[PDB]
Design a protein around this ligand. Structure first.
Ligand SMILES: [Zn+2]
Ligand SMILES: [Zn+2]
Ligand SMILES: [Zn+2]
Ligand SMILES: [Zn+2]
Ligand SMILES: [Zn+2]
Ligand SMILES: [Zn+2]
Ligand SMILES: [Zn+2]
Ligand SMILES: [Zn+2]
Lengths: 115, 115, 116, 115
């Protein structure tokens, strides 16, 4: 995949499974245009988001839906999404893995960019 | 102080000093409206951004300018900003501290919400 | 302070309050010798750990006791401490703040090293 | 795999490749006994460290060697290792994945424990 998203639940120490993910790309008119979406697999991973051809250069936002992921803990999180914005592919082709370690009031995210 | 932003340089182990922070609030037309702005201090801290009265419930985005901040490292970062989005207030006065520990291809952020 | 420790609860979005912290310094014979201890304040901070004089150069370990901090959540964490090791003071004096963002199965820590 | 380690370079946005990892187990005399070793792959991963039979309950330390790893960067890190300690395997086998996002003065680590 040119783009993969991996989400871990840092509270329970498990992949975050069946979590909805929306990807957007910044359009000419400065709006976020929907790009790809899905739900995480059993390994916390969302593969098959885009194709080489479709994954053009631009600014991308990854939105991971957390609103009620935390419901069973009794905690309302800091925001309904965990969001990460990255600027893509200005030097040839790159594949991107956006990895996110999520808690209700904190998250760590790393973009791994390979060629 | 309803809203404080603290930015740390995780590569150099130092406050991120004199770094521009823009705060926005999600507006009626779904765009981000400029809400408050400042530059981090020698302690990497940004105080006096807003007032209890201006800081109503809503969805806020903290945008930390990182474009050229690691020029001197010779690394172009994952994106020209570090962005943290949080949903505010609900009940009545809540004080927010958004702490970000920044690296070019990563970040960790925690929202500390008190009384 | 030559050394300060700040601990945040990443699950509840709070300072982690009244949490025990042990600091060790690696001894000549390659054991951790107790250095300082205490519990975090209402701001998640532990001040007055050491002095200028006592904070000699060396390898230090900070243990933050987390075992039952999580109890009320119904979660047993990855380890009974969150631990950070750092190498201290290799030129002139430096002040160190160790900041830790903790969850049961994850943490992020940053050492902020400034010269006074 | 009972124990897998994955290391990401948060400064360059890559896997941490060819990095030495030493695993220890807390021994009877309270010292750290050498338990397993390897070097991370091209994908920042370290597999085949131990077997289900050797990996009994106990306290384990994962030591990632970072001393000269950002020297090209011109940065001496907070410590010559990144260390993660976890308490293992109350019950029967669990698979552990220790994921570590490393910067010179900072790191984020998550233990993913699965059945
Ligand atoms: Zn894939
Ligand atoms: Zn800005
Ligand atoms: Zn203030
Ligand atoms: Zn941006
Ligand atoms: Zn102090
Ligand atoms: Zn080692
Ligand atoms: Zn494996
Ligand atoms: Zn070490």
């Amino acid at each position: 995949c040119p783009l993969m998203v991996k989400v871990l639940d840092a509270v329970r120490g498990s992949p975050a499974i069946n979590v909805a993910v929306h990807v957007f790309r910044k359009a000419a008119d400065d709006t976020w245009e929907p790009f790809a979406s899905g739900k995480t697999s059993e390994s916390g991973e969302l593969h098959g988001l885009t194709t080489e051809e479709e994954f053009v250069e631009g600014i991308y936002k990854v939105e991971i839906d957390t609103k009620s992921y935390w419901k069973a803990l009794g905690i309302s999180p800091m925001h309904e999404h965990a969001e990460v914005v990255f600027t893509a592919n200005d030097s040839g082709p790159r594949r991107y893995t956006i990895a996110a370690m999520l808690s209700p009031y904190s998250y760590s995210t790393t973009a791994v960019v390979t060629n």
